[PDB]
């Protein structure tokens with residue numbers, strides 16, 4: 001409708017819908033987050049969202065969805081962002097299976113560097129969830145920002161909760177299944193609070209020591225960004241442009 005033709009609805013968020021936008025001349029596809037101004041005013045997060053968008057504009061990380069422009073109308077806010085073609089990562093895992101060891105390490109390094117970048121450059125937060133991790137045309141991980149615009153850890157905390165989530169995403173990459181999964185809801189939290197997760201034969205021992213630390217119950221005893229950056233398995237074939 002504006003600037004870019006508006007097509008099919010991708011999803012429906014809290015502040016409003018998110019649709020696809022094709023270019024009227026070139027055919028370039030973008031993702032438009034439509035945020036309702038009245039809904040923002042009713043939620044008393046006017047300054048919170050305005051400062052979040054200002055912080056997202058100065059964001060420059062290739063494994064995070066970039067914000068191009070924000071068009072303002074008296075009814076809604078139009079966040080023009082990059083369209084990630086291949087949907088969610090976890091959608092690919094359950095449909096295809098497990099990813100190879102050196103390929104899962106490639107995706108993990110892209111995910112962790114992005115998570116760390118978000119915590120040191122964002123005012124407001126939502127805990128990271130496998131919903132945020134998306135896959136592009138080049139099969140690279142693209143993470144959505146932890147803001148108001150868009151199986152929890154044991155145990156307010158920000159990076160500590162996300163490191164545990166990175167451990168869940170890491171497990172799913174070289175296993176195909178989740179580290180903790182049970183049909184019964186009370187026993188699911190019991191496995192998490194106990195840190196009991198199955199370790200497969202095909203899994204390496206160096207990554208097993210990293211996974212054990214990342215999925216630690218006590219957040220004080222749990223691995224930090226520096227702890228993972230100093231680990232042998234994570235350091236192997238890690239690109240210099242990150243961190």
Ligand SMILES: CNC(=O)c1ccccc1Oc1nc(Nc2cc(OC)c(OC)c(OC)c2)ncc1Br
Nearest residue numbers: 010011018031081082083084085087088132144150
């Ligand atoms: C509907 N989109 C969302 O809910 C969404 C959530 C977090 C971050 C960005 C989001 O929207 C975005 N989603 C894409 N790629 C994308 C591609 C999809 O394939 C149709 C897709 O549905 C399978 C999809 O929703 C699952 C997203 N890229 C940028 C944004 Br911006």
